[PDB]
């Protein structure tokens, strides 16, 4: 569990900042889409549950 937790923490820390998303920067949304497709929301919701 520790390895997966560390990997998810690193992936979250690499997410683009909010103001980068709200101010264009298409590469930021590209990285965000890559992270989104990497792991679904249901996985996180189940993990917290």
């Amino acid at each position: 569990m520790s390895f997966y937790a560390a990997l998810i923490d690193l992936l979250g820390r690499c997410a683009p900042e909010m103001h980068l998303i709200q101010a264009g920067k298409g590469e930021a949304l590209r990285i965000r889409a890559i992270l989104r497709s990497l792991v679904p929301l249901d996985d996180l919701v189940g993990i917290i549950s």
């Binding site: 298409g26 590209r30 890559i34 497709s37 990497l38």
Partner: protein
């Protein structure tokens, strides 16, 4: 040549190790009706020729990364180089290759779908080339016949050939796959016949052409005729030439070069089956020993053995308009001419001259070639694809049309509901009348084009 310049016709070939020895497949897409892409086998061309009409791609631009970014930010024959972003345009449909934001594989693998887009606007229609194993370098020029890898811009994924539970599909994943762009053609001379051109085979004067039997015929439209008159305007007289060569199958035609004649409307290849004569046959029974033909002036000439294959564009000799040559078989070696078995009073036909193959033909059978417009060829290809799809839909409907369901709803193959819906929408958009705010001359030209397209679609059916 042999340098992969801008604005040439290329095909994306790949090698697969699924088969025991090897397999060669070319990327292809139907265009209208189906946006997705699929691989078409080519190594098994001895008996089953491939469909090269929907395989050719055209290189539109080869800009660098920074220039591409500036162009995208500023929206509203350059030699290809490694590390550059390229735009590929489908030859049949005026659509651009792109990586769609969809996926259906049951295994995510961060993989998307590879398809087509109606417009070049956006970022997903550009692919950046990267070098293969370290025999080249970044920024170095690109030569033909050299393997490389294509990287998407929007998805940042390779053009990969999957080996999943499916059968050799193509997607955009993170797995590396090597592709090469074989150059179909290059800068071509004006008014010269080259392999792949859809054209009409005219005989004698400008009122006779080599056509096929019309729809709603007694036979299965497998009898080759010599009808003339208004048939020269329809899509029946549209034939295409497929050289046996696969890499440079766009070069200028050569006398005595073996070629296959294909009817674009029906998808059947001219052949001699030694059972009924000169008839068009299906693609499955299209071995080179029966389907290969050629053109040559000087009918007898004491013909010698052809040789000296050309690995480039080659010199142009067969000129459009003045191409009075004779067609003969290579494997057998017999000519063709108008049969005219008997001038019956009640023949019920203007000419009704069957096409037959003879060891020594009659006189005045030389055929001169004239090319057709791009719109006519595209309309013929759409007619063929649409007729095939609707026939498949009708057969699927009729398979279950007799027995109530009760249980087990799938009686046989599933009906292509989504494909037929997309084809119907594409056809509805295709026949949209021009807007009333256009200028009078251009509006009249568009109206004439639409009327011609409607007549072409109606002549080959599409109403019954």
């Amino acid at each position: 040549v042999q340098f992969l310049r801008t604005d040439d016709e290329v095909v994306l070939q790949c090698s697969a190790t699924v088969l025991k020895e090897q397999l060669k497949l070319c990327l292809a897409a139907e265009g209208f009706g189906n946006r997705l892409c699929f691989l078409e086998p080519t190594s098994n061309a001895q008996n089953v020729p491939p469909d090269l009409a929907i395989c050719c791609f055209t290189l539109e631009q080869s800009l660098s990364v920074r220039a591409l970014q500036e162009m995208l930010a500023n929206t509203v024959h350059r030699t290809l180089l490694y590390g550059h972003a390229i735009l590929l345009r489908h030859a049949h449909s005026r659509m651009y290759l792109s990586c769609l934001t969809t996926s259906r594989s049951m295994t995510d693998k961060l993989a998307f779908d590879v398809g087509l887009q109606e417009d070049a606007t956006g970022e997903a229609c550009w692919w950046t080339m990267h070098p293969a194993s370290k025999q080249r370098s970044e920024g170095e020029k690109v030569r033909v016949g050299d393997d490389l890898i294509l990287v998407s811009v929007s998805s940042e994924r390779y053009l990969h050939l999957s080996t999943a539970s499916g059968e050799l599909q193509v997607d955009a994943s993170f797995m590396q796959t090597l592709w090469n762009m074989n150059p179909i053609c290059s800068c071509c001379e004006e008014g010269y016949v080259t392999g792949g051109h859809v054209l009409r085979l005219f005989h004698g004067h400008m009122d006779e052409c080599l056509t096929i039997s019309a729809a709603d015929s007694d036979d299965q439209r497998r009898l080759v005729y010599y009808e003339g008159g208004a048939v020269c305007t329809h899509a029946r007289s549209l034939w295409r030439l497929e050289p046996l060569r696969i890499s440079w199958s766009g070069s200028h035609l050569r006398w005595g070069q073996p070629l296959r004649i294909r009817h674009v409307t029906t998808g059947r290849y001219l052949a001699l089956t030694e059972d009924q004569g000169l008839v068009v046959v299906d693609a499955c029974k299209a071995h080179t020993k029966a389907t290969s033909f050629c053109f040559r002036v000087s009918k007898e000439k004491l013909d010698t053995a052809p040789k000296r294959d050309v690995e480039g564009m080659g010199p142009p000799e067969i000129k459009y308009g003045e191409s009075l040559c004779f067609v003969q078989h290579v494997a057998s070696g017999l000519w063709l001419t108008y049969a005219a078995p008997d001038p019956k009073a009640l023949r019920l036909g203007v000419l009704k001259k069957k096409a037959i193959l003879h060891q020594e033909g009659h006189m005045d059978d030389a055929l001169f070639l004239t090319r057709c417009q791009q719109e006519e060829s595209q309309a013929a290809r759409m007619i063929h694809s649409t007729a095939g799809l609707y026939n498949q839909f009708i057969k699927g409907l009729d398979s279950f049309s007799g027995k109530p369901r009760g249980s087990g709803p799938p009686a046989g193959p599933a009906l292509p509901i989504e494909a037929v819906i997309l084809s119907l929408q594409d056809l509805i958009g295709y026949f949209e009348p021009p807007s009333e705010e256009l200028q009078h001359e251009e509006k009249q030209s568009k109206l004439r084009s639409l009327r011609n397209r409607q007549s072409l679609f109606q002549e080959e059916g599409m109403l019954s």
